Amino acid sequence: TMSLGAENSVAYSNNSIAIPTNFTISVTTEILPVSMTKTSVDCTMYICGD
């Protein structure tokens, strides 16, 4: 049975906050298709040939 994710319990209380003291510059990749192969079909040659 696949695990959804690691279990994390957030330490919520009514008067406590968590403030970051540092940062990470993260570069991530996103690959998106833009175009396809442009195809032309000769209908007469495909169906009947010569």
């Binding site: 990749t29 690959i31 298709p33 396809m36 192969t37 195809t39 079909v41 009947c48």
Partner: protein, 49 residues
């Protein structure tokens, strides 16, 4: 990493290969070759094939 673009190329190439492969189908006729159909039958039944 580059599965999306390769996937698109694969679908286009596979569609073209299937379209070329479909010429080898009789489609309920005696032969898949048109020249054989002319060379073997009279025009009333060759027209049907």
């Amino acid at each position: 990493a580059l599965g999306k673009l390769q996937d698109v190329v694969n679908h286009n190439a596979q569609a073209l290969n299937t379209l070329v492969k479909q010429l080898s189908s009789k489609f309920g006729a005696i032969s898949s070759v048109l020249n054989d159909i002319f060379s073997r039958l009279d025009p009333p039944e060759a027209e049907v094939q």
